[PDB]
């Protein structure tokens, strides 16, 4: 089964309890599926967002059509949509209770791998359509191999080490210099200024 | 507005100033570094063996011929014991000094095809060349003796 598996619109057992939109699941760096597993190429999420069944279908169809099943294999690194999103009826005034469940999404945090590909192939063969998929994803994304991912991580570390600016967001936030914690968020103490909402500023040091 | 917005939320001016002041500053390297200061050896042996074994050598520019015309010329040359050789100039240039051929340096530029042999059928080869009024015979060096075109003609006659 080398080709990418089908993803269902909603969980087979539908959720009954509406749940709050905890945007923290999109906010911040990703702590899961951040490393390669049984593959050499992948789509890395350089930002946060929700993946709909439409995005899943786009990824599946594009990758399946453009891959070589006898020499390439692909695997999801993101679960099927599970978080329920509720929409009220059009023309409804505010109030009257939380709306009924409309769709299911899967939260994705910046720094996570969405699809992982491997097999008897090199990056150049796959980067084309992986970049197509990444550009059509709801969040900033990039086709990255193991080597390129390590290269970008080492480049970030090098920039952090050799930055000539005496002042860093990390230092100022941690020390509460200028009383900037009045303007910053408690999450900023760990985001170090590299994350703003769902957006991940990669050039930010 | 929620903490996570579909658009890039406007930052408080103090946060904007913080982000501008804590920007990455690359290390300026003072003076720009930009303006500061198997097959090859196989064919080496091949050329050495060719030079040693062959008694007479000549060169030409067999590049203006079709595939079929070149094949026919090769057939006519193989009718005699003469063999046509093709080798890159990039690696032929060292061979002249290696084999002590100083006068051969200004002969191998651009396309060059050797015509190595021991028994000269140069008379019939020149006759074949005559009906094709191009592909001139180019200077060579028989048995460590450089011969010009007039030298080859005299030797043929």
């Amino acid at each position: 089964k080398p080709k990418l598996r089908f993803i269902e619109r909603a969980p087979l057992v539908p959720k009954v309890r509406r749940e709050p939109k905890n945007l923290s699941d999109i906010r911040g760096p990703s702590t899961e599926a951040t490393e390669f597993t049984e593959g050499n190429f992948a789509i890395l999420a350089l930002g946060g967002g929700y993946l709909h069944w439409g995005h899943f279908e786009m990824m599946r169809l594009t990758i399946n059509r453009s891959m070589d099943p006898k020499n390439m294999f692909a695997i999801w690194r993101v679960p099927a949509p599970f978080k329920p999103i509720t929409r009220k009826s059009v023309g409804h005034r505010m109030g009257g209770g939380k709306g009924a469940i409309d769709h299911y999404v899967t939260p994705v945090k910046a720094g996570r791998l969405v699809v992982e590909m491997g097999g008897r192939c090199e990056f150049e063969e796959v980067q084309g359509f992986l970049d197509q998929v990444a550009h059509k994803l709801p969040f900033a994304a990039k086709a990255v191999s193991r080597g390129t991912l390590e290269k970008m991580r080492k480049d970030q570390e090098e920039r952090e080490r050799n930055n000539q600016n005496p002042w860093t967001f990390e230092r100022i936030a941690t020390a509460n210099m200028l009383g900037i914690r009045k303007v910053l968020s408690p999450y900023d103490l760990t985001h170090k200024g590299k994350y703003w909402g769902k957006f991940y500023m990669p050039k930010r040091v | 507005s929620k903490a996570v917005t579909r658009h890039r939320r406007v930052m408080h001016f103090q946060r904007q100033k913080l982000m501008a002041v804590t920007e990455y500053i690359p290390p300026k390297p003072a003076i720009h570094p930009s303006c500061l200061p198997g097959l090859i050896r196989l064919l080496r042996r091949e050329i050495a063996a060719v030079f040693q074994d062959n008694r007479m050598i000549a060169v030409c520019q067999n590049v203006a011929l079709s595939a079929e015309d070149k094949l026919l010329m090769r057939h006519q040359l193989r009718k005699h014991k003469i063999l046509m050789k093709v080798f890159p100039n990039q690696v032929l240039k060292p061979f002249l000094e290696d084999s002590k051929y100083q006068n051969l340096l200004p002969l191998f530029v651009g396309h060059n095809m050797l015509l190595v042999s021991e028994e000269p059928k140069v008379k019939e080869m020149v006759r074949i060349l005559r009906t094709v009024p191009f592909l001139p015979l180019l200077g060579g060096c028989i048995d460590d003796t450089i011969l010009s075109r007039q030298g080859f003609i005299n030797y043929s006659k």
Binding site: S66, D68, E122, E124, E125, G128, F129 | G38, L39, L42
Partner: peptide, 23 residues
Amino acid sequence: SREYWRRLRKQNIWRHNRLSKNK
């Protein structure tokens, strides 16, 4: 060895073909 580099050239052509399958 001539055949060594002949095989190397064949493999390089194969790699180029695989890379250009999409290009």
